[PDB]
RNA sequence: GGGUGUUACAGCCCCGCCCCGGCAGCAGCAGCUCGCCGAAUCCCGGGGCCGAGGGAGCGAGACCCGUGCGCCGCGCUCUC
RNA sequence: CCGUCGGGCCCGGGGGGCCACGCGUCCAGCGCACGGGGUCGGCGGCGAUGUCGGCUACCCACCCGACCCGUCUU
RNA sequence: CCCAUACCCGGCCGUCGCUGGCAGUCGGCAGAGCGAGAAAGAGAGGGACGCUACGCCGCGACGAGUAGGAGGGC
């Protein structure tokens, strides 16, 4: 029992603290703190009473089994991997899809999800793209920002919202959320000159155009 | 609505003077002519598009006549914009000098 | 101190230095 | 066992050289303090050319 | 002289070398020096019980 | 253009004194004026290739039958 | 006598950092991970009459390589 | 900057070496270990796989070849 404090020393570099173990002793104040030193269940049957032993023994055995794996440590399930993001993507940037069927459509990024997929949404008045997930790899992070730091992203939408559950029909829950976030960005993309015309246009490469030659 | 892969030429396999190893191809990306500008297309996925007689399936479409072999560039070659590339299978030698596609979607920007 | 042969008696105050 | 490079793998190095941690804990606060006074020597020049 | 290329190595150069390419001849077998016990298992009788003992 | 000449309506070099005359500054983001390095050296990123092997055991300990993230190795919080 | 960002736990005396922890006499449990070789407690697809898959073994074409074996002989 | 079957790293095959490791499958007559720097002792007073021991397991190093020689061929 007690109030569990944060780490007394900060992470200086990953795997390194700012204070030595001799410096952590006096910081922890241990110099004044010498600390010295189941399944058998009986149940009545109306006879007498009987005792079942739960997790009862298996009744069939395959001829051969695989022996157990060795114990490795740096192999964690996907729900506990760290989620990275390019520094060029700041919320309010305009992206360009490359692999999804909205190829080259100019689309607006909003936020990062839990899994690592991104909440990138096109204006449905301009882009015909809903609130959609798209991985950061398939993204052209353009250097064109809009201050979406005043919009209110809905908390009820998450990674499970966009799962392919099981013919697709847009559910009546889905048509609420596309409208509710639109009511702040649709005026914001018109406070910027020639921006709603940018998003209707689709990205493409012409002759004599090289991506490494240009900046976007 | 427009082309989203860059133009690439398959000059030949990795060769010395009198021996060649098919496990990597040598691409000539159109536009780059030096080692310094090869840094952008490094890592991007490349594909060879050709067509055959028997119809083969298309993921997300009717079974077409076209087939592909996927690959990706390994490292930059020479000093004049050339780049190595390894594919899943070795490229067939009929693809010499034809156009293969270097898409951008493994982009890192 | 770290001697296993002649330092048995040596590593004694430290087991009481932790308590 | 696979011989991991002790120079880039950090824990292999401290498995063999524990003082390398304090060798690595120092030469950071030295460097940051060096970068600190290096900025101050650049900052004091801006108050020197104007006066 | 025409076969070899020798020179006086630097403290950093040997520090690179014993760490990155350290291999020991325990029982006529090229075994890896990733553990301070193995140095102490065979060079314990010369007060060489760690990698830094071997470098010095 | 010429030749004369000696700072003159421009400079170049040299010596002595001026605290090495002092002033930032420093093998310099005047990113190429020339060096050698790193116990006097560490951080961050990008790409490529592979994932071989598979009963490593912990603590309740004969005051008990469970658990399989367990060895070395670094330091986290709690019994202030 | 000077000189050493000297050497002596940098001899002893009148602001940053330490693998620093008790008294007296005498001369222990939890979680975290650059930790004894990869896992996902992460996924998307098309698939019944024309598609999927089959290294090789049938044919074909191209790139590179490639002189006909047995033998006597330096 | 370009690259050889040489070099480094890794997977695999075989050979050689340690004249290597395994009879301890010691289970309600049970108590689960001999990687540990150090001439020598955890001494008395209901429980997978396995081991044709000519089997199996583990480390390292090595691999050209006519004349010739030996081995092994389920």
XYZ file of C-alpha atoms (C1' of nucleotides) in Angstrom:
679
model
C 0.000 0.000 0.000
C 1.134 3.541 -0.749
C 1.134 6.115 -3.474
C 3.126 4.652 -6.381
C 5.223 7.457 -7.804
C 6.521 7.844 -11.324
C 10.144 6.913 -11.987
C 12.426 9.100 -9.881
C 14.985 9.181 -12.677
C 13.938 10.022 -16.249
C 14.751 7.928 -19.289
C 17.854 9.663 -20.614
C 18.367 7.371 -23.606
C 16.237 4.242 -24.130
C 17.574 1.755 -21.605
C 19.488 4.411 -19.629
C 18.445 6.496 -16.624
C 19.815 9.900 -15.676
C 20.794 8.781 -12.158
C 23.261 6.058 -11.227
C 22.265 3.215 -8.919
C 24.261 4.904 -6.175
C 22.415 8.106 -7.043
C 19.156 6.153 -7.104
C 19.799 4.912 -3.562
C 19.758 8.372 -1.967
C 16.945 9.423 -4.301
C 14.874 6.423 -3.194
C 15.806 7.281 0.431
C 16.611 3.678 1.355
C 19.379 4.670 3.788
C 16.805 5.219 6.558
C 14.698 2.255 5.422
C 16.448 -0.998 6.295
C 13.670 -3.544 5.672
C 14.688 -6.761 7.423
C 12.957 -10.137 7.507
C -8.583 -26.435 -4.981
C -10.594 -28.131 -7.734
C -11.874 -30.976 -5.550
C -15.450 -29.863 -4.846
C -17.917 -31.958 -2.857
C -21.525 -31.718 -4.023
C -24.680 -33.446 -2.744
C -26.660 -35.972 -4.772
C -30.059 -37.120 -3.545
C -26.625 -42.064 -2.136
C -24.704 -39.715 0.117
C -22.512 -36.942 -1.301
C -19.932 -36.967 -4.103
C -16.708 -35.061 -4.772
C -15.965 -34.092 -8.361
C -12.350 -33.340 -9.300
C -12.576 -30.528 -11.844
C -10.388 -30.284 -14.945
C -11.094 -33.968 -15.413
C -8.527 -36.118 -17.169
C -8.578 -36.244 -20.980
C -10.275 -39.234 -22.560
C -8.451 -39.345 -25.900
C -4.793 -39.028 -26.818
C -3.270 -38.402 -30.251
C -0.357 -40.690 -31.017
C 2.290 -37.957 -31.183
C 2.392 -34.306 -30.106
C 4.681 -31.361 -30.797
C 7.105 -30.609 -27.943
C 6.901 -27.142 -26.445
C 8.743 -24.217 -27.981
C 11.681 -22.537 -26.326
C 11.150 -19.248 -24.516
C 11.975 -16.120 -26.512
C 11.251 -12.696 -25.113
C 11.246 -10.003 -27.782
C 8.210 -11.425 -29.590
C 5.069 -9.609 -28.436
C 1.565 -9.765 -29.946
C 0.443 -7.057 -32.340
C -1.763 -5.283 -29.796
C 1.343 -4.332 -27.785
C 3.685 -3.122 -30.534
C 4.585 0.553 -30.486
C 2.780 2.625 -33.111
C 5.032 4.804 -35.255
C 4.214 7.771 -37.502
C 6.209 9.970 -39.856
C 7.015 13.418 -38.527
C 5.850 14.905 -41.843
C 2.276 13.828 -41.038
C 0.845 16.429 -38.658
C -2.948 16.345 -38.104
C -4.397 18.621 -40.756
C -2.145 17.489 -43.575
C -3.523 16.483 -46.961
C -2.547 13.029 -48.190
C -2.733 11.122 -51.471
C -3.806 7.480 -51.673
C -1.759 5.207 -53.934
C -3.035 1.640 -53.543
C -6.678 1.967 -52.502
C -9.357 2.293 -55.187
C -9.357 6.060 -54.547
C -5.989 6.103 -56.343
C -4.446 9.556 -56.376
C -7.481 11.154 -54.739
C -6.494 14.090 -52.532
C -7.599 13.313 -49.006
C -7.434 14.923 -45.539
C -5.759 13.263 -42.559
C -7.315 13.595 -39.118
C -5.743 11.345 -36.468
C -3.935 8.113 -35.664
C -5.864 5.034 -34.577
C -4.902 2.360 -32.054
C -3.720 -0.353 -34.470
C -1.523 2.051 -36.419
C -3.868 2.628 -39.329
C -4.729 6.258 -39.929
C -8.014 8.174 -39.815
C -7.843 9.818 -43.213
C -11.092 11.234 -44.536
C -11.981 12.944 -47.760
C -14.747 15.507 -47.979
C -17.699 13.524 -49.311
C -18.808 16.674 -51.151
C -15.441 16.613 -52.947
C -13.715 13.253 -52.675
C -16.414 10.527 -52.416
C -14.283 9.019 -49.642
C -15.762 8.365 -46.186
C -14.111 8.147 -42.810
C -11.616 5.504 -43.899
C -8.600 3.635 -42.580
C -5.384 3.761 -44.604
C -1.856 2.753 -43.618
C 0.821 5.455 -43.427
C 2.969 3.607 -45.964
C 0.524 4.276 -48.818
C 0.475 8.043 -48.254
C 1.962 11.117 -49.920
C 2.343 13.594 -47.054
C 1.939 16.972 -48.756
C 3.311 20.087 -47.033
C -0.140 21.755 -46.898
C -1.792 22.062 -43.496
C -5.166 23.235 -42.228
C -5.662 24.054 -38.547
C -7.915 21.157 -37.570
C -6.781 21.549 -33.964
C -10.199 23.091 -33.245
C -12.416 20.304 -34.589
C -14.000 17.742 -32.259
C -13.109 14.210 -33.363
C -15.800 11.755 -32.206
C -14.593 9.473 -29.428
C -17.058 6.672 -30.200
C -15.284 5.791 -33.465
C -12.203 3.586 -33.035
C -10.499 0.661 -34.796
C -13.439 -1.683 -34.194
C -15.718 0.853 -35.908
C -14.057 0.251 -39.288
C -13.692 -3.541 -39.116
C -14.912 -5.655 -42.019
C -17.402 -7.600 -39.895
C -18.969 -10.118 -42.274
C -22.817 -7.234 -49.542
C -21.871 -3.892 -47.993
C -24.558 -1.309 -47.272
C -23.895 1.979 -45.488
C -25.514 1.638 -42.073
C -27.572 4.473 -40.608
C -25.029 4.847 -37.816
C -22.313 5.478 -40.410
C -24.141 8.319 -42.167
C -24.254 10.326 -38.933
C -20.519 10.609 -38.371
C -19.531 11.625 -41.908
C -21.831 14.642 -41.604
C -20.833 15.653 -38.070
C -17.117 16.174 -38.747
C -17.864 17.670 -42.150
C -19.630 20.719 -40.662
C -16.319 22.241 -39.482
C -13.827 21.278 -42.211
C -16.146 22.119 -45.123
C -16.139 25.808 -44.082
C -12.426 25.499 -43.299
C -11.550 24.199 -46.765
C -13.380 27.204 -48.204
C -11.660 29.766 -45.981
C -8.503 28.716 -47.869
C -8.495 29.927 -51.506
C -8.670 27.240 -54.222
C -8.543 24.387 -51.713
C -11.850 22.663 -52.442
C -10.736 22.655 -56.073
C -7.502 20.945 -55.035
C -9.317 18.040 -53.388
C -11.580 17.338 -56.366
C -8.487 17.027 -58.555
C -6.744 13.652 -58.628
C -2.986 13.143 -58.392
C -1.214 11.941 -61.521
C 2.159 11.994 -63.258
C 2.672 13.441 -66.720
C 5.528 13.172 -69.183
C 8.712 14.826 -67.988
C 7.531 14.681 -64.364
C 9.675 12.820 -61.836
C 8.771 12.553 -58.120
C 12.383 12.619 -56.947
C 12.952 15.682 -59.126
C 10.048 17.574 -57.536
C 9.033 18.494 -54.016
C 5.397 18.195 -52.977
C -6.991 8.676 -63.631
C -3.330 9.014 -64.534
C -0.184 6.928 -64.465
C 0.978 6.392 -60.885
C 4.086 4.338 -61.612
C 7.315 5.663 -63.003
C 8.857 4.480 -66.255
C 11.545 1.827 -65.812
C 13.659 -0.050 -68.349
C 15.030 -3.563 -67.883
C 18.515 -3.269 -69.355
C 19.744 -6.678 -68.243
C 20.647 -9.020 -65.421
C 23.458 -8.608 -62.928
C 26.495 -9.632 -64.927
C 30.233 -9.381 -64.748
C 32.047 -9.613 -68.052
C 31.274 -13.239 -68.985
C 28.953 -14.425 -66.207
C 25.514 -13.279 -65.138
C 23.317 -14.018 -62.127
C 19.584 -13.830 -62.738
C 18.564 -13.348 -59.101
C 18.773 -9.539 -59.411
C 17.722 -7.290 -62.286
C 19.219 -3.937 -63.279
C 16.658 -1.177 -63.742
C 17.068 2.154 -65.488
C 14.574 4.481 -63.834
C 13.663 7.291 -66.188
C 14.762 10.643 -64.813
C 17.595 9.682 -62.476
C 21.150 9.832 -63.830
C 23.332 9.853 -60.706
C 23.705 8.132 -57.356
C 22.493 11.104 -55.318
C 18.992 11.106 -56.822
C 18.584 7.324 -56.566
C 17.815 7.695 -52.856
C 14.104 8.375 -53.330
C 13.115 5.291 -55.330
C 15.127 3.072 -52.982
C 12.802 0.581 -51.325
C 9.799 1.165 -53.579
C 8.023 -1.847 -55.049
C 8.480 -2.625 -58.738
C 6.414 -4.789 -61.066
C 6.622 -6.236 -64.570
C 3.327 -6.297 -66.466
C 2.925 -8.684 -69.395
C 0.024 -10.546 -70.972
C -0.484 -14.217 -71.792
C -3.017 -16.301 -73.709
C -4.861 -18.181 -70.971
C -7.012 -15.934 -68.800
C -5.779 -15.527 -65.236
C -7.632 -14.041 -62.274
C -7.348 -10.465 -61.090
C -7.785 -9.707 -57.379
C -10.729 -7.351 -57.457
C -11.771 -7.872 -61.049
C -12.685 -10.190 -63.874
C -9.979 -12.746 -64.818
C -7.790 -10.859 -67.272
C -5.081 -11.865 -69.740
C -2.348 -9.982 -67.883
C 0.145 -11.482 -65.447
C 2.667 -9.867 -63.113
C 5.828 -10.689 -61.210
C 6.484 -8.460 -58.213
C 9.804 -7.188 -56.954
C 11.589 -4.302 -55.284
C 14.824 -2.416 -55.844
C 17.742 -3.487 -53.658
C 20.352 -0.741 -54.008
C 21.625 1.878 -56.421
C 23.947 0.745 -59.201
C 26.846 2.462 -60.910
C 27.168 6.236 -60.754
C 24.560 7.111 -63.358
C 21.131 6.563 -61.834
C 21.075 2.791 -62.379
C 19.551 0.668 -59.630
C 19.525 -3.017 -58.787
C 16.259 -4.872 -58.246
C 15.310 -8.352 -57.045
C 12.008 -9.982 -57.977
C 10.116 -12.984 -56.658
C 10.982 -15.066 -59.715
C 13.796 -14.217 -62.078
C 12.667 -11.905 -64.847
C 12.249 -13.749 -68.156
C 14.826 -12.707 -70.717
C 12.158 -11.572 -73.170
C 11.665 -8.525 -70.920
C 14.967 -7.002 -72.079
C 14.424 -3.319 -72.770
C 10.697 -3.406 -72.067
C 8.805 -1.130 -69.692
C 8.282 -2.206 -66.090
C 6.473 -0.225 -63.418
C 8.067 1.219 -60.277
C 5.111 2.220 -58.113
C 5.528 4.644 -55.232
C 3.266 3.112 -52.558
C 6.036 1.800 -50.228
C 6.908 5.543 -49.957
C 8.601 6.844 -46.819
C 7.862 10.580 -46.918
C 35.618 -10.071 -0.976
C 34.784 -11.985 -4.159
C 37.141 -14.815 -3.163
C 35.137 -18.051 -2.763
C 37.910 -19.876 -0.890
C 39.372 -17.387 1.613
C 36.603 -14.776 1.495
C 33.738 -16.772 2.983
C 33.892 -14.827 6.263
C 34.398 -11.634 4.215
C 30.978 -11.576 2.528
C 29.105 -11.444 5.837
C 28.534 -7.795 6.798
C 27.019 -7.115 3.371
C 24.244 -9.697 3.836
C 23.577 -7.746 7.032
C 24.252 -4.506 5.152
C 21.170 -5.120 3.017
C 18.851 -5.740 5.988
C 24.412 -19.024 -28.853
C 24.491 -16.250 -31.436
C 27.331 -13.802 -30.849
C 25.482 -10.493 -30.902
C 27.622 -7.416 -31.569
C 28.259 -5.893 -28.123
C 28.809 -2.477 -29.696
C 25.260 -1.937 -30.959
C 23.417 -4.401 -28.724
C 23.488 -2.517 -25.444
C 22.655 -5.300 -22.990
C 25.353 -7.608 -24.362
C 27.858 -4.866 -23.544
C 26.679 -4.501 -19.945
C 26.555 -8.285 -19.673
C 30.335 -8.097 -20.173
C 31.304 -4.526 -19.188
C 29.034 -3.061 -16.494
C 31.150 0.094 -16.271
C 30.252 0.768 -19.903
C 26.836 1.893 -18.636
C 28.405 4.626 -16.532
C 30.788 5.175 -19.429
C 27.606 5.639 -21.486
C 25.691 7.507 -18.779
C 28.539 9.993 -18.740
C 29.618 11.546 -22.065
C 25.959 12.548 -22.425
C 25.532 14.988 -19.569
C 29.049 16.072 -20.466
C 27.992 16.518 -24.095
C 24.686 18.211 -23.256
C 26.470 20.586 -20.893
C 29.031 21.099 -23.654
C 26.211 21.843 -26.090
C 24.671 24.097 -23.437
C 27.673 26.404 -23.033
C 28.256 26.225 -26.793
C 24.834 27.819 -27.271
C 25.640 30.399 -24.572
C 28.858 31.329 -26.376
C 26.718 31.779 -29.476
C 24.086 33.616 -27.435
C 26.592 35.994 -25.819
C 27.889 37.036 -29.250
C 24.451 38.399 -30.149
C 24.609 40.656 -27.087
C 28.192 41.568 -28.047
C 27.857 42.794 -31.638
C 24.901 45.090 -30.938
C 26.390 46.946 -27.949
C 56.933 -8.313 -45.696
C 55.311 -8.881 -49.144
C 52.659 -11.136 -47.643
C 51.362 -9.283 -44.576
C 50.083 -5.817 -43.695
C 50.923 -4.955 -40.094
C 50.843 -1.804 -37.990
C 50.513 -0.551 -34.433
C 46.836 -0.784 -33.487
C 44.914 1.882 -31.617
C 43.083 1.453 -28.317
C 39.808 2.000 -30.159
C 40.887 -0.480 -32.849
C 41.513 -3.267 -30.353
C 38.329 -2.295 -28.500
C 36.389 -2.780 -31.718
C 38.172 -6.028 -32.433
C 37.904 -8.015 -29.199
C 34.213 -7.133 -28.946
C 33.077 -7.605 -32.544
C 35.356 -10.504 -33.524
C 36.281 -12.108 -30.220
C 36.610 -15.887 -30.489
C 38.381 -18.181 -28.034
C 40.235 -21.476 -28.406
C 38.573 -23.455 -25.622
C 39.502 -27.153 -25.987
C 40.756 -26.586 -29.564
C 37.309 -25.273 -30.507
C 36.522 -21.809 -31.842
C 33.943 -20.749 -29.285
C 32.400 -17.288 -28.966
C 33.439 -14.855 -26.222
C 30.023 -13.530 -25.260
C 30.314 -14.525 -21.597
C 32.834 -13.429 -18.981
C 32.741 -16.931 -17.471
C 34.541 -18.539 -20.420
C 37.454 -16.123 -20.146
C 37.476 -16.809 -16.427
C 37.098 -20.556 -17.067
C 40.411 -20.761 -18.945
C 42.297 -17.556 -18.053
C 41.221 -17.480 -14.415
C 44.710 -18.542 -13.359
C 46.185 -15.287 -14.738
C 43.733 -12.841 -13.091
C 41.962 -12.498 -16.467
C 38.296 -12.979 -15.577
C 36.527 -10.466 -17.829
C 36.777 -9.029 -21.322
C 38.229 -5.812 -19.915
C 40.834 -7.963 -18.175
C 41.762 -9.354 -21.581
C 41.903 -5.912 -23.203
C 44.174 -4.538 -20.478
C 51.324 53.911 -73.746
C 56.225 55.115 -71.987
C 59.896 56.264 -68.329
C 61.068 58.979 -63.886
C 59.934 57.703 -58.702
C 58.871 55.324 -52.865
C 52.789 55.855 -50.471
C 51.185 60.851 -52.631
C 44.193 61.492 -54.507
C 46.214 53.130 -54.023
C 48.576 49.423 -51.886
C 52.642 45.194 -50.715
C 56.555 43.632 -47.374
C 59.932 44.070 -43.006
C 61.755 45.406 -37.952
C 61.268 47.235 -32.967
C 58.113 48.786 -29.214
C 52.824 48.368 -27.908
C 50.899 42.101 -21.883
C 52.216 36.994 -27.617
C 49.060 44.955 -28.552
C 44.172 43.465 -27.434
C 39.190 41.724 -29.440
C 35.231 37.373 -30.890
C 36.581 32.863 -32.592
C 38.458 28.060 -33.085
C 41.041 22.138 -37.435
C 34.846 27.167 -37.492
C 27.915 26.423 -40.870
C 32.785 32.029 -44.233
C 28.801 23.281 -44.490
C 35.728 22.704 -49.516
C 41.750 26.810 -46.578
C 44.859 22.682 -45.345
C 45.412 17.766 -40.523
C 45.070 13.421 -37.513
C 41.844 11.029 -34.497
C 38.016 9.296 -30.414
C 38.260 5.672 -22.839
C 39.851 12.509 -26.357
C 32.231 9.256 -28.936
C 27.762 9.119 -28.402
C 22.638 9.845 -30.346
C 18.843 9.426 -34.441
C 17.145 7.602 -39.171
C 16.779 4.965 -44.020
C 17.095 0.451 -47.255
C 18.440 -4.717 -48.161
C 18.796 -9.943 -46.619
C 17.483 -13.966 -42.958
C 14.315 -16.085 -38.464
C 18.011 -21.617 -37.926
C 16.771 -24.147 -33.209
C 12.277 -25.815 -30.040
C 10.473 -30.036 -22.315
C 15.776 -23.209 -21.043
C 11.693 -24.367 -16.066
C 10.063 -21.195 -11.742
C 8.010 -21.573 -6.105
C 4.803 -24.160 -2.248
C 9.032 -27.218 -0.862
C 7.745 -34.120 2.025
C 4.170 -27.713 6.975
C 2.867 -29.586 -0.857
C 1.089 -31.048 -6.288
C 0.205 -25.405 -8.655
C 2.388 -22.680 -12.621
C 5.274 -22.331 -17.551
C 7.797 -15.215 -19.389
C 11.967 -19.157 -17.078
C 18.709 -18.391 -16.968
C 22.318 -14.770 -16.952
C 22.207 -9.517 -17.382
C 19.992 -3.609 -16.605
C 16.889 -0.815 -13.342
C 10.801 -0.219 -12.110
C 7.366 0.621 -8.180
C 5.546 -0.948 -2.929
C 6.473 -2.621 2.760
C 8.885 6.244 4.672
C 64.160 27.508 -7.479
C 60.604 27.078 -11.483
C 57.489 24.120 -14.576
C 53.317 19.588 -14.809
C 44.427 20.791 -16.633
C 51.424 15.321 -12.934
C 51.494 10.834 -9.207
C 50.321 9.384 -4.326
C 41.446 6.373 -3.380
C 45.066 13.981 -6.890
C 49.355 13.903 0.922
C 47.182 16.134 4.895
C 45.231 20.553 6.980
C 41.533 25.481 8.029
C 28.739 23.444 -7.578
C 28.577 18.389 -9.713
C 28.974 13.431 -8.463
C 29.807 8.303 -5.869
C 28.619 0.418 -7.563
C 28.673 5.129 -0.652
C 25.449 2.747 4.454
C 24.119 -0.435 10.395
C 26.245 -1.420 16.219
C 30.190 -2.717 19.616
C 35.386 -3.978 21.079
C 40.669 -3.934 20.276
C 45.592 -3.190 17.471
C 11.383 -10.261 0.219
C 7.514 -9.994 -3.546
C 5.836 -7.599 -8.733
C 5.473 -5.729 -13.321
C 9.318 -3.297 -17.631
C 12.718 -4.908 -21.532
C 18.757 -3.200 -27.143
C 18.399 -9.783 -21.977
C 20.270 -17.851 -23.650
C 18.238 -17.548 -32.956
C 10.118 -14.970 -34.504
C 6.295 -13.903 -33.368
C 1.464 -11.638 -34.182
C -3.546 -12.725 -28.176
C -2.773 -8.635 -36.833
C -5.075 -8.721 -41.338
C -7.273 -8.373 -47.045
C -8.527 -11.119 -51.340
C -10.743 -14.609 -55.282
C -12.201 -19.630 -55.757
C -17.959 -24.760 -59.954
C -17.450 -24.866 -65.368
C -13.141 -22.148 -66.008
C -10.562 -20.958 -62.977
C -6.583 -22.238 -58.771
C -2.180 -25.113 -58.069
C 1.674 -28.891 -59.926
C 9.944 -27.946 -58.762
C 10.825 -31.544 -62.309
C 9.408 -34.707 -66.185
C 6.578 -32.773 -73.028
C 7.284 -28.896 -76.556
C 8.768 -23.897 -77.471
C 11.378 -19.174 -77.261
C 14.983 -15.729 -75.217
C 19.770 -14.080 -71.997
C 24.434 -15.915 -70.535
C 27.659 -19.938 -70.585
C 29.018 -23.770 -73.804
C 34.510 -27.158 -79.418
C 33.440 -34.580 -79.157
C 33.805 -38.284 -76.449
C 37.352 -42.887 -75.536
C 42.661 -43.061 -75.531
C 48.743 -42.660 -75.679
C 51.083 -38.208 -74.132
C 54.797 -32.767 -70.872
C 31.793 2.911 -58.786
C 32.030 -2.499 -61.371
C 32.990 -8.104 -59.570
C 35.512 -14.319 -58.774
C 33.379 -20.789 -56.253
C 38.753 -16.207 -52.357
C 36.784 -13.119 -47.606
C 32.597 -12.011 -43.694
C 27.688 -13.458 -42.037
C 23.590 -17.133 -42.363
C 20.746 -21.802 -43.905
C 21.777 -26.840 -45.359
C 24.785 -31.636 -46.528
C 28.806 -34.778 -45.380
C 33.479 -35.846 -43.156
C 36.753 -35.247 -38.956
C 37.545 -33.967 -34.007
C 36.318 -33.399 -28.963
C 38.993 -40.717 -28.236
C 32.385 -35.612 -26.539
C 26.783 -35.948 -23.741
C 22.686 -39.601 -22.555
C 21.107 -46.561 -18.737
C 18.751 -40.665 -14.042
C 12.332 -42.945 -17.837
C 16.279 -42.015 -10.103
C 7.637 -40.489 -9.809
C 2.914 -41.164 -2.968
C 9.643 -46.734 -1.102
C 8.856 -39.707 -5.778
C 11.100 -34.525 -4.581
C 12.655 -32.859 -10.446
C 20.159 -30.193 -9.872
C 25.720 -30.811 -11.203
C 27.717 -23.745 -16.601
C 30.692 -23.396 -11.948
C 36.382 -18.604 -12.659
C 38.965 -21.359 -8.387
C 43.328 -29.411 -5.314
C 37.502 -31.729 -2.934
C 30.874 -33.686 -0.375
C 23.298 -30.246 -1.727
C 27.282 -37.322 2.864
C 26.074 -39.859 7.802
C 26.919 -39.346 13.108
C -1.414 -37.720 -10.812
C 3.612 -36.455 -13.807
C 5.004 -35.272 -22.851
C 8.935 -36.977 -26.253
C 12.978 -40.654 -25.538
C 17.303 -45.383 -25.797
C 17.097 -50.211 -33.748
C 23.363 -47.635 -26.919
C 25.565 -50.655 -34.618
C 20.579 -45.839 -31.162
C 20.290 -40.788 -30.159
C 22.123 -35.846 -28.853
C 25.594 -31.502 -28.802
C 29.259 -28.227 -29.908
C 33.542 -26.379 -33.165
C 36.970 -26.963 -37.668
C 37.220 -28.740 -42.693
C 35.427 -30.023 -48.017
C 39.793 -29.667 -55.386
C 41.630 -34.109 -57.636
C 43.862 -38.085 -62.458
C 47.438 -42.869 -61.466
C 46.360 -45.166 -56.867
C 44.250 -46.830 -51.746
C 40.399 -47.611 -48.172
C 35.350 -47.220 -46.456
C 29.901 -47.540 -47.005
C 25.947 -48.697 -50.163
C 17.802 -50.222 -47.287
